[PDB]
A paper describes a structure:
In eukaryotes, genomic DNA is tightly compacted by the nucleosome, in which roughly 150 base pairs (bp) of DNA are wrapped around a histone octamer composed of two each of histones H2A, H2B, H3, and H4 (Luger et al., 1997). In chromatin, genome activities, such as transcription, replication, recombination, and repair, are generally suppressed and epigenetically regulated through chromatin structure. Single amino acid substitutions of histones substantially affect the structure and stability of the nucleosome (Flaus et al., 2004; Kruger et al., 1995; Kurumizaka & Wolffe, 1997; Muthurajan et al., 2004), suggesting that these alterations may disturb proper gene regulation in chromatin (Kruger & Herskowitz, 1991; Peterson et al., 1991; Sternberg et al., 1987). In addition, the canonical H3.1 Glu97 to Lys (H3E97K) mutation has been found in cancer cells, and reportedly reduces the nucleosome stability (Arimura et al., 2018; Bagert et al., 2021).
To overcome this problem, we reconstituted the H3E97K nucleosome with the Widom 601 DNA, which is known to form stable nucleosomes (Lowary & Widom, 1998). For comparison, we also determined the cryo‐EM structure of the wild‐type nucleosome with the Widom 601 DNA. In the wild‐type nucleosome, the sidechain carbonyl group of the H3 Glu97 residue forms hydrogen bonds with the main‐chain N atoms of the H3 Leu61 and Ile62 residues. We found that the entry/exit DNA regions of the H3E97K nucleosome are flexibly disordered, as compared with those of the wild‐type nucleosome.
Author numbering:
A (entry chain B): 21 to 102
B (entry chain A): 40 to 135
C (entry chain G): 10 to 118
D (entry chain H), E (entry chain D): 33 to 124
F (entry chain C): 11 to 119
G (entry chain F): 22 to 102
H (entry chain E): 39 to 135
Write the structure that this text describes.
DNA sequence: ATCGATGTATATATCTGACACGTGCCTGGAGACTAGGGAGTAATCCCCTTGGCGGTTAAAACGCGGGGGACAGCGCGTACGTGCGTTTAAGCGGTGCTAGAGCTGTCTACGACCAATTGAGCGGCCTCGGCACCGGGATTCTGAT
DNA sequence: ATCAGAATCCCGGTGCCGAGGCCGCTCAATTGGTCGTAGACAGCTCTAGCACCGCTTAAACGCACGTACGCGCTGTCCCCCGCGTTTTAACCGCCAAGGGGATTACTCCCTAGTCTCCAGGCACGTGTCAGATATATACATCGAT
């Protein structure tokens, strides 16, 4: 149903993220590498969150599932627990 | 016409003062739904769940870019290259 | 007849709820039994840490001329304090932003 | 009945900054922080009781867990606050 | 009197490598590995039971904890082994 | 009263189901433990042990040795991608390191 | 008693770097390595002594060191028994 | 028949990556451990296995750090590791200076 | 220096929507009392940690020459930044509809508990084979020619 | 290509000490019965997640042009490596002592469990004021001269 959605992470958005990281000049090959890195990270988080959702017999991924998935990857997130 | 680097420094200052999300919401939501199709079909998402995913992803990428910038400055460059990202992820222990 | 009920928080001179912390300790599967003073000690520690963070965030808000604390002020308070940053190193504050920081070598000649 | 720490956090804020308010998003951040620190201290204290073949969690386990988890000067003042609270409570 | 996994590790070794022995230092490594993995899986199963307001750890929690903790193809074969063992156990 | 059978033999396992059940009860993990949870846990532990032992035995044979030492366990773990991912933050005592020299340091020509 | 950090000699640091695959070592590396090792050891020993004191013992055991390493994400195999 | 610079270093790399023995002398390391621990509690006793475990952890940590430092040095087109490389590796790891 | 373009900082007014306070009730916290078993304490024993000494030899320390590697400077060519005109789709507001999350009740299967029994696993003793160490011959590899 | 010499590999003999097997016994796992409640399942409420449409406008996109920068090359010199000699201290063994860790027994006081009671803390409601937006305008900053 959905295809080529990683392109939706556009080059200006990646540039903005790198600006917040303090980067001054960006190589043109950075954008595809960043897209791949983001896809890997998202795949790992979403896999754990969906495992939590399946365990609960739910069909909806809740924010608590995402919080627990992040927590178990050593990336604790504040502000979504309630 | 400004010299190359002035606008970049202004953009750095502007985006380091603010706290809003830098990725557009609808494309990220579509990406999240596409990725989750490989794990379970007909999955629904709370809006707060997608927002949590976006916050985590943007924080992760910004931190990665900070480390990448350090690696680029180590090689006496001002331009970040894919090898800088690879080195930073390798030192962090992330999967290649 | 029964004496007037006195909260365990007020007995220990605390704002944080001693009884709720006791109930959470009993039901968390942490141990078979919970001592009388463990909830008091835990509540005092939690209240102290909350006070430290709130004080730093209030200072950050006042310096910004704001009268309300938002997640940005909490992030500024945590990241600018060496010990709090060491305790909350692996944590992401949602809408907290980053510390403004530009490398010296990147600055104009 | 969705329990939280908002009322006690608000009381603490009014103690340290009587003039200053807090937004709801920042209150959620505070709730997450309190829950996280509770989980950390309780887990360390549970491990300490299990390591020493004890079935009870006392204020000694809490103090040792605080010494293990909190850095530097944070641990000293937190230990002082906990000891003061326990002493005051023991004297009613 | 200190319990360990040496006799079952040796039985498994004789099943997979009949002619191969093992030194005591390697046996200590193996015991540490078994205890570490047991603790990881039990902690994740306890968290899963707590998250869903359940008071029982069953094979469903062990299976989910395995899927969470083991990587890639390790999780698939471990899940298959666990299911086969439980099926054999309940039939007998 | 029948001839008593170990639960491990019923499940066809070498690892002890009863000891795993007792360790789960002693653990402070949950109020109750189901009947199949120790069997499942024992089967998983046995499978992981067998995988590591098979790889370590192959490493020992490749070195013309008949006894597994910590070096062989380290070589088995670090050469297998899944096991390396599982045991990534683990230090094997007396295990050493994988032989690996960066190609840029090799002699020219 | 006093000057023990110099007991970690230059040839020992060279051996550790050789096991890490290092071909050439700058002369300023030895002092930096001594500082790094001192910090690491101080953290681990502080945690282990806290574990020892909680048990009201006067002797640091290997189990204390294993727990101290474990709580720093440095899990150590082969000393648990 | 003097060996060129780098040949003996490569031989040493091969030798020390093939072996598993400890590379720090035991008696100086034990003195270091006892000296450091004195600042936390006086009149402390140590099991021999405790000191052995500490030494194993320390050597493993330093070897991993030297691997990351070597990668940092190669990133800057050098073959010599320098204190800046150790500092960068420790900073990217998230360890404290 | 120097003036121009311009993005940014300061001053004041408006409003709106989110924070701060008030109310009812109910459900979680407090007081009282009893039982029992967890833990504190004292005595004991024996093991394992610390200290000392002598030797002897491997390792560490020191000195020195040299070559190779770090670093600075320069040239060049290309790839990135910036600005502008066009197009694309994100965001928002509104509506409709249904999947499914959350809650309640019923009931039965399943897991805790207890007492008796027995066989698995532990600790201690003994032996013999895997591994290490040595010595000598063969091959490899390195560096200068 | 050549050839000398150091390093390494291989092959065999010796020995020693640790892994592996055997036996007694004791205590942990097993069996059988009972009963209490956790959770599985069905049913109902009504929330919120999804789909669709239309409009607006900001962001994204594509192109052109210039120059800043990455990278390759060369020269210099200094600082690391390799090696021989002297010193020093680690390691090993052997002996002594006593400190403190593990165990057992005894007692009591601290915590769980139950019941009763009541007042704290949470959903609902609503007003007023903190900050965002708007506009005007000073002003510091860049950058070519």
């Amino acid at each position: 149903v959905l295809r080529d959605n990683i392109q939706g992470i556009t080059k200006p958005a990646i540039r903005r993220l790198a600006r917040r990281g303090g980067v001054k000049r960006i190589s043109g090959l950075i954008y595809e590498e960043t897209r791949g890195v983001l896809k890997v990270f998202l795949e790992n988080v979403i896999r754990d969150a969906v495992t939590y959702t399946e365990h609960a017999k739910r069909k909806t991924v809740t924010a608590m599932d995402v919080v627990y998935a992040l927590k178990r990857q050593g990336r604790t997130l504040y502000g979504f627990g309630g | 016409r400004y010299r190359p680097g002035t606008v970049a420094l202004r953009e750095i200052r502007r985006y380091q003062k603010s706290t809003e999300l830098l990725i557009r919401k609808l494309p990220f939501q579509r990406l999240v739904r596409e990725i989750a199709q490989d794990f379970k079909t007909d999955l629904r998402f709370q809006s707060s769940a997608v927002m949590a995913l976006q916050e985590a992803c943007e924080a992760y990428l910004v931190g990665l870019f900070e480390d990448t910038n350090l690696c680029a400055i180590h090689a006496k460059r001002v331009t970040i290259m894919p090898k800088d990202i690879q080195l930073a992820r390798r030192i962090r222990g992330e999967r290649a | 007849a029964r004496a007037k009920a006195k909260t365990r928080s007020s007995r220990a001179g605390l704002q944080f709820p001693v009884g709720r912390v006791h109930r959470l300790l009993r039901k968390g599967n942490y141990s078979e039994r919970v001592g009388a003073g463990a909830p008091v000690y835990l509540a005092a520690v939690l209240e102290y840490l909350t006070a430290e963070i709130l004080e730093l965030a209030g200072n950050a808000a006042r310096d910004n001329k704001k009268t309300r604390i938002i997640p940005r002020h909490l992030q500024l308070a945590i990241r600018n304090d060496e010990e709090l940053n060491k305790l909350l190193g692996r944590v992401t504050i949602a809408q907290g932003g980053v510390l403004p920081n530009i490398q010296a070598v990147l600055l104009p000649k | 009945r969705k329990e939280s720490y908002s009322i006690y956090v608000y009381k603490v804020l009014k103690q340290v900054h009587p003039d200053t308010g807090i937004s709801s998003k920042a209150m959620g951040i505070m709730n997450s922080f309190v829950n996280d620190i509770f989980e950390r201290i309780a887990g360390e204290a549970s491990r300490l009781a299990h390591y020493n073949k004890r079935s009870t969690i006392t204020s000694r386990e809490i103090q040792t867990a605080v010494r293990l988890l909190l850095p530097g000067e944070l641990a000293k003042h937190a230990v002082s606050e906990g000891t003061k609270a326990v002493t005051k409570y023991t004297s009613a």
